[PDB]
Amino acid sequence: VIEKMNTQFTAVGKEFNKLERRMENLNKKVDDGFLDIWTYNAELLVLLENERTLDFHD
Amino acid sequence: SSFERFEIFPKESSWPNHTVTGVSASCSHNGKSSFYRNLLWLTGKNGLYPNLSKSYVNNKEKEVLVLWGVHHPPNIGNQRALYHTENAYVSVVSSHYSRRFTPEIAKRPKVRDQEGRINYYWTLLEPGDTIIFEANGNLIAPWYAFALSRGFGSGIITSNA
Amino acid sequence: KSYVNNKEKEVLVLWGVHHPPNIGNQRALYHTENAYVSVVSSHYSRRFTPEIAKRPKVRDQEGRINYYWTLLEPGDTIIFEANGNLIAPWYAFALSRGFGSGIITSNA
Ligand SMILES: *[C@@H]1O[C@H](CO)[C@@H](O[C@@H]2O[C@H](CO)[C@@H](O)[C@H](O)[C@H]2NC(C)=O)[C@H](O)[C@H]1NC(C)=O
Numbered sequence: 001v002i003e004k005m006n007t008q009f010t011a012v013g014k015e016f017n018k019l020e021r022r023m024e025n026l027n028k029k030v031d032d033g034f035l036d037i038w039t040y041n042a043e044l045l046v047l048l049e050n051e052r053t054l055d056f057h058d
Numbered sequence: 059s060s061f062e063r064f065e066i067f068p069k070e071s072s073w074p075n076h077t078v079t080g081v082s083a084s085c086s087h088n089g090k091s092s093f094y095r096n097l098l099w100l101t102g103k104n105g106l107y108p109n110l111s112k113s114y115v116n117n118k119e120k121e122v123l124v125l126w127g128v129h130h131p132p133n134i135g136n137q138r139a140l141y142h143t144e145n146a147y148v149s150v151v152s153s154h155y156s157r158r159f160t161p162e163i164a165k166r167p168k169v170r171d172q173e174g175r176i177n178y179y180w181t182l183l184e185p186g187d188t189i190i191f192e193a194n195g196n197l198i199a200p201w202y203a204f205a206l207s208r209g210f211g212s213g214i215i216t217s218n219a
Numbered sequence: 220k221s222y223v224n225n226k227e228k229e230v231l232v233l234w235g236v237h238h239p240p241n242i243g244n245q246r247a248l249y250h251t252e253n254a255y256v257s258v259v260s261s262h263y264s265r266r267f268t269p270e271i272a273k274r275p276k277v278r279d280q281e282g283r284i285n286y287y288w289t290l291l292e293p294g295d296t297i298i299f300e301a302n303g304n305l306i307a308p309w310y311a312f313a314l315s316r317g318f319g320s321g322i323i324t325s326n327a
């Protein structure tokens with residue numbers, strides 16, 4: 001679970017101007033999209049692994 | 059990875075035919091009117107503001123970040139006091155860059171204690187290329203420039219830690 | 220003209236610039252050919268000039284009006300200047316923005 005995560009050096013934040021609001025909102029859309037995907041998958045993955053782990057031990 | 063701040067256009071030898079002095083109260087330092095260290099405000103000398111022409115060759119194996127600005131007086135009297143032509147422009151070109159700028163003189167709401175404005179512009183000069191600067195007024199000249207060697211992108215973080 | 224934003228709201232200010240199809244039209248409405256308008260605020264600056272040209276007709280017009288706008292923050296000021304071709308702001312909107320939502324197209 002840990003090793004398959006691809007960790008790369010990154011630069012997450014981006015700056016936008018007053019008239020670049022659509023770009024800012026797309027940048028936000030991208031962050032929220034990725035965040036909801038990773039959050040949903042991380043929560044769900046852990047719950048599924050926990051059910052299997054407890055069943056594994058039983 | 060490397061940020062060399064070098065003097066691109068040495069003050070004393072680069073501009074002997076005009077004024078390389080002049081400060082603003084708005085940039086005051088320790089009570090004295092002042093200005094930026096990497097930029098030089100150019101004004102006329104003894105009534106003259108000659109056409110300027112400068113050329114920098116990038117002889118380093120680095121990109122060079124060149125900064126400059128354009129003065130935008132609040133009025134005509136200010137432009138005439140500093141520059142002696144109303145139809146002022148500056149021009150900056152390189153093998154793959156070209157911009158022409160003119161002042162926009164207007165009354166503006168004050169910011170700090172100023173009515174006029176200075177716009178800031180920049181370009182990255184690739185190794186082996188050249189930047190040619192021209193002006194007949196309103197030039198804030200590059201004085202220092204940075205020879206850059208860029209690393210893997212990282213970021214600007216805001217924190218008081 | 221100078222408008223001071225004395226409301227605790229952003230003010231949306233609209234204006235436009237007239238772009239005559241020809242010289243006779245510009246002279247008929249404005250009495251200078253070297254017309255410009257200028258709009259500034261503490262953090263805004265634009266200068267505009269007319270572009271006079273014959274254009275294909277749209278509706279029944281040969282000329283055009285461009286529309287421009289800015290959001291004025293509380294406490295700031297917009298200074299407008301012109302010597303011709305100004306479509307002046309008359310009304311403006313004092314805004315208080317909510318969480319972003321959207322423009323939806325539907326005949327429902
Ligand atoms: C550097 O930052 C300081 C802090 O904001 C500036 O000091 C303020 O200057 C304004 C006038 O422009 C005064 O009304 C404030 O009272 C000052 N603040 C303090 C805490 O003394 C300073 O002017 C800035 N200097 C430069 C060169 O940008």
Ligand SMILES: *[C@@H]1O[C@H](CO)[C@@H](O)[C@H](O)[C@H]1NC(C)=O
Pocket residue numbers: 072074075
């Ligand atoms: C300064 O002006 C003189 C003419 O008075 C000219 O010969 C000289 O080349 C100029 N120097 C520079 C750096 O422009």
